[PDB]
Amino acid sequence: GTVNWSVEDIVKGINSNNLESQLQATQAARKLLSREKQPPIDNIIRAGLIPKFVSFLGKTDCSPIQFESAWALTNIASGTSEQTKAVVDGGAIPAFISLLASPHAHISEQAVWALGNIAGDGSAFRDLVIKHGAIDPLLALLAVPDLSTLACGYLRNLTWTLSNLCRNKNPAPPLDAVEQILPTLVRLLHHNDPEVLADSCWAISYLTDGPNERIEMVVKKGVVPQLVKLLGATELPIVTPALRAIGNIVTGTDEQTQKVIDAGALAVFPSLLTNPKTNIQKEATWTMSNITAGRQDQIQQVVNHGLVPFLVGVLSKADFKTQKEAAWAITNYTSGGTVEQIVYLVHCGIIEPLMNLLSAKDTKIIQVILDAISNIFQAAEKLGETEKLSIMIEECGGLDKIEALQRHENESVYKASLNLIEKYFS
Numbered sequence: 227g228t229v230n231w232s233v234e235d236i237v238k239g240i241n242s243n244n245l246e247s248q249l250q251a252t253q254a255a256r257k258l259l260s261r262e263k264q265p266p267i268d269n270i271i272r273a274g275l276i277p278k279f280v281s282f283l284g285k286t287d288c289s290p291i292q293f294e295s296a297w298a299l300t301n302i303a304s305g306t307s308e309q310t311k312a313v314v315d316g317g318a319i320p321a322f323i324s325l326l327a328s329p330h331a332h333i334s335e336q337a338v339w340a341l342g343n344i345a346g347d348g349s350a351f352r353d354l355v356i357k358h359g360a361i362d363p364l365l366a367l368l369a370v371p372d373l374s375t376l377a378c379g380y381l382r383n384l385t386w387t388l389s390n391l392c393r394n395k396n397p398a399p400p401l402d403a404v405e406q407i408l409p410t411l412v413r414l415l416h417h418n419d420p421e422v423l424a425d426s427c428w429a430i431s432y433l434t435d436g437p438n439e440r441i442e443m444v445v446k447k448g449v450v451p452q453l454v455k456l457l458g459a460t461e462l463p464i465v466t467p468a469l470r471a472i473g474n475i476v477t478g479t480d481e482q483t484q485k486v487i488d489a490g491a492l493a494v495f496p497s498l499l500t501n502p503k504t505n506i507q508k509e510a511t512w513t514m515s516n517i518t519a520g521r522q523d524q525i526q527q528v529v530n531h532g533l534v535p536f537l538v539g540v541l542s543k544a545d546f547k548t549q550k551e552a553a554w555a556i557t558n559y560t561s562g563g564t565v566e567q568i569v570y571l572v573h574c575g576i577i578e579p580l581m582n583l584l585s586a587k588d589t590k591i592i593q594v595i596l597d598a599i600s601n602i603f604q605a606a607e608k609l610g611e612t613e614k615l616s617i618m619i620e621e622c623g624g625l626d627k628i629e630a631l632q633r634h635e636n637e638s639v640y641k642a643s644l645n646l647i648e649k650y651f652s
């Protein structure tokens with residue numbers, strides 16, 4: 227019936243003076259734009275159909291053409307930035323916001339998904355959607371005593387859209403909008419559906435990706451324990467953003483980091499630091515690098531939870547990018563830790579994997595490792611054990627790497643390598 231029409235025939239129907247013919251042609255267009263192999267979006271746009279679709283959004287009298295045009299538009303709006311812009315310039319944002327309160331669930335849901343793709347395209351459109359007033363009617367869609375009474379796909383859609391209103395930076399979303407959305411987000415964060423939980427976590431990871439002030443806004447709603455719980459989930463799509471969110475939070479103050487530790491997060495890290503998914507291992511190690519950059523009492527908790535051996539593990543063998551994160555975790559630990567904490571670290575075997583990484587063709591990790599070696603010597607000085615440390619390093623072939631670093635291209639490494647040779651290796 228409306229299957230494989232040409233653009234020319236769609237234009238003919240949409241331009242006819244017959245609502246039924248227009249509906250028929252709009253559905254044809256929706257099916258065209260839904261096809262999997264290269265949907266002819268730009269031809270639809272060139273034909274001038276977006277303004278017509280938009281006007282159809284306002285036909286309260288004919289709910290089927292509201293739905294088909296909403297769907298056609300949503301297909302276009304999920305495309306490139308240029309294609310999304312074409313939809314916005316057609317006046318679609320307020321028309322979609324009007325449709326949020328539609329008595330038809332299918333139409334309301336279509337409006338939710340359209341606004342999510344528009345807002346998700348970038349900071350400016352996100353903020354434009356907020357300015358047109360989308361948040362109140364979106365939130366009102368979730369105003370029921372129990373989320374479990376809503377349709378599943380409906381809830382997932384609302385959650386996904388809410389997370390796009392939280393999503394980009396330069397600038398981050400308006401403080402007022404974040405505060406308006408955060409309580410609904412906290413509620414969705416305890417909802418038992420894996421996809422809703424994943425998208426709520428993504429939303430929280432966006433909101434915590436910024437200065438300590440924005441971290442505090444989230445942390446003050448009390449979500450850190452639920453985030454830590456989700457950190458232990460079995461679904462990787464949940465774990466990934468829960469870990470991103472935790473990672474962001476420990477870039478904050480000592481107090482904000484302490485909330486993560488108090489919630490029990492460290493006990494999840496033996497499995498995260500040995501996780502089969504490379505990016506989970508890398509983000510867990512980055513997270514550890516920010517915790518070892520904290521207070522000595524926070525370093526001590528890392529020690530107590532048995533995590534130092536796992537850091538030695540990741541330094542010894544991991545994806546290189548992960549090894550780089552572990553190098554940073556070690557330099558931060560040695561820069562801030564007590565003498566006893568540094569001694570313990572050497573007792574766990576850090577020296578040989580640290581020296582082995584001096585072979586890396588990566589200038590910045592070399593400085594990180596050299597600084598770390600210097601920090602450990604500084605601790606050995608206060609105990610008069612610089613010589614025993616020297617021999618350790620010399621036994622595992624560390625000297626060879628260091629006397630070579632001497633020769634190589636970089637500013638600071640040259641300077642750093644000489645100093646160590648001159649001062650601790652006769």
Ligand SMILES: NCCCC[C@@H](NCc1ccc(-c2cccnc2)cc1)C(N)=O
Nearest residue numbers: 476477478483515516517519520551554
């Ligand atoms: N708990 C937050 C501490 C923030 C300040 C603290 N940040 C330390 C730090 C420094 C560098 C990294 C880092 C650098 C590069 C790659 N991965 C991690 C991580 C943490 C510092 N400058 O000593």
